[PDB]
Design an enzyme around this catalytic site. Structure first.
Site, PDB file in Angstrom:
ATOM      1  CG  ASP A 151      -6.065  -5.404  -2.648  1.00 14.55           C
ATOM      2  OD1 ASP A 151      -6.974  -5.010  -2.387  1.00 14.55           O
ATOM      3  OD2 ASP A 151      -4.800  -4.813  -2.934  1.00 14.55           O
TER       4      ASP A 151
ATOM      5  CG  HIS B   3      -5.261  -3.359   0.489  1.00 11.32           C
ATOM      6  ND1 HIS B   3      -4.686  -2.986  -0.843  1.00 11.32           N
ATOM      7  CD2 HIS B   3      -4.978  -2.611   1.448  1.00 11.32           C
ATOM      8  CE1 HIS B   3      -4.167  -1.747  -0.532  1.00 11.32           C
ATOM      9  NE2 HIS B   3      -4.335  -1.429   0.738  1.00 11.32           N
TER      10      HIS B   3
ATOM     11  CD1 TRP C 113      -9.023   3.192   0.334  1.00 14.20           C
ATOM     12  CD2 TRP C 113      -8.958   1.246   1.334  1.00 14.20           C
ATOM     13  NE1 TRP C 113      -7.962   3.151   0.857  1.00 14.20           N
ATOM     14  CE2 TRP C 113      -7.786   1.820   1.567  1.00 14.20           C
ATOM     15  CE3 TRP C 113      -9.037  -0.026   1.793  1.00 14.20           C
ATOM     16  CZ2 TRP C 113      -6.658   1.414   2.084  1.00 14.20           C
ATOM     17  CZ3 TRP C 113      -7.902  -0.445   2.422  1.00 14.20           C
ATOM     18  CH2 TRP C 113      -6.845  -0.091   2.761  1.00 14.20           C
TER      19      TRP C 113
ATOM     20  CG  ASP D  77      -2.241   0.955   1.168  1.00 19.20           C
ATOM     21  OD1 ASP D  77      -2.940   0.699   0.300  1.00 19.20           O
ATOM     22  OD2 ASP D  77      -1.919   1.789   1.892  1.00 19.20           O
ATOM     23  CD1 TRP D  78      -1.747   5.255   1.203  1.00 20.93           C
ATOM     24  CD2 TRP D  78       0.108   6.535   0.352  1.00 20.93           C
ATOM     25  NE1 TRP D  78      -2.083   6.269   0.330  1.00 20.93           N
ATOM     26  CE2 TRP D  78      -1.066   7.032  -0.239  1.00 20.93           C
ATOM     27  CE3 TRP D  78       1.340   7.185   0.035  1.00 20.93           C
ATOM     28  CZ2 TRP D  78      -1.101   8.186  -0.809  1.00 20.93           C
ATOM     29  CZ3 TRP D  78       1.334   8.087  -0.754  1.00 20.93           C
ATOM     30  CH2 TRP D  78       0.258   8.654  -1.117  1.00 20.93           C
TER      31      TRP D  78
HETATM   32 BR    BR Z   1      -5.437   5.259   0.686  1.00 25.45          BR
END
Ligand code: BR
Ligand code: BR
Ligand code: BR
EC number: 3.8.1.5
Length: 310
Positions: free
Chosen positions: A260, A289, A175, A124-125
């Site tokens: 995901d 995810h 999300w 992710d980030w």
């Molecule tokens: Br996000």
């Protein structure tokens, strides 16, 4: 300077499966008055450091099943909490959080701790930001373990890293809605929805850093950055693509959370091709995810792969 608040320590008193002791870095270059929390497990003198970067809207607690595995292998494990998350300080104004604010913090953390022989572990980030780090100091990076993530480049350069923002309706759209709209956002409920395998106790751990709304500025600003990418973020991420393609020569391991709806196969295969030397991804069927929630398997297999290439 940056108006921020700190989560009472009592909030972390009853965490489930989080026996990792706290370490802190106060007043980092460019981050005065801000206290960053991070984990430092395993041999402090190990020749290998697994830099575990978390994402939205989690913290180092996410890597709690992976840390033990890397440490048992004799490696050092560094898992920091981004400002606004976990045990780190949380700026109150969303306008304080930016791509470079989170990126420079990571670069300042690496220099301060003088990390070398790094095995970058992202998702992710953690990856949007992490994948842009090596090009700034390549001698420090050795390997990479990539889980569901990609680069925040523009739509033209890489359509696969933009398409997921709009479709499917129940993916990033859902999300981001769940994150930026509630006046009284409950992250334990959010995570139980986006990580159906979590137990009640585990979900509570994701709510722990935030007693209330005033602590969630960083949480709210993250998805808004995936939707609205500033010029620096685009330039930096575009330059990062060229690095993984033309410069990277380290060992790589990829793991995909097949269920995901945000950064699955659609984003991961284009990603695998961009990363020079990236082998055939490990596809984890039951994972969503948050692949790290199926992280022991990722961690173990990544070590086996790394050894067979030593
Ligand atoms: Br996000
Ligand atoms: Br899950
Ligand atoms: Br919460």
């Amino acid at each position: 300077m940056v108006n921020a608040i700190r989560t009472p320590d009592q909030r972390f008193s009853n965490l489930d499966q989080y026996p990792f002791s706290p370490n802190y870095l106060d007043d980092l270059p460019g981050y005065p008055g801000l206290r960053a929390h991070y984990l430092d497990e395993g041999n402090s003198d190990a020749e290998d450091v697994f830099l575990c970067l978390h994402g939205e809207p989690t913290w180092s607690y996410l890597y709690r099943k992976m840390i033990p595995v890397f440490a048992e292998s004799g490696a050092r494990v560094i898992a920091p909490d981004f400002f606004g998350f976990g045990k780190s300080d949380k700026p109150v104004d969303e306008e304080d959080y930016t791509f470079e604010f989170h990126r420079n913090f990571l670069l300042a953390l690496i220099e301060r701790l003088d990390l070398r022989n790094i095995t970058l572990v992202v998702q992710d980030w953690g990856g949007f930001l992490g994948l842009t780090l090596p090009m700034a100091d390549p001698s420090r990076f050795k390997r990479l373990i990539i889980m569901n993530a990609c680069l925040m480049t523009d739509p033209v350069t890489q359509p696969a890293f933009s398409a997921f923002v709009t479709q499917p309706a129940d993916g990033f759209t859902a999300w981001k809605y769940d994150l930026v709209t509630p006046s009284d956002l409950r992250l334990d409920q959010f995570m139980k929805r986006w990580a159906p395998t979590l137990t009640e106790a585990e979900a509570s751990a994701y709510a722990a850093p935030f007693p209330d709304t005033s602590y969630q500025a960083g949480v709210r600003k993250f998805p808004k950055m995936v939707a609205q990418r500033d010029q620096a973020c685009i330039d930096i991420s575009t330059e990062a693509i060229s690095f993984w393609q033309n410069d990277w020569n380290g060992q790589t391991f990829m793991a995909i959370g097949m269920k995901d709806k945000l950064l699955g196969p659609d984003v991961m295969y284009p990603m695998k091709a961009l990363i020079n030397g990236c082998p055939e991804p490990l596809e984890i069927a039951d994972a969503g995810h948050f692949v790290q929630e199926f992280g022991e398997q990722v961690a173990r297999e990544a070590l086996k792969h790394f050894a067979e290439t030593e």
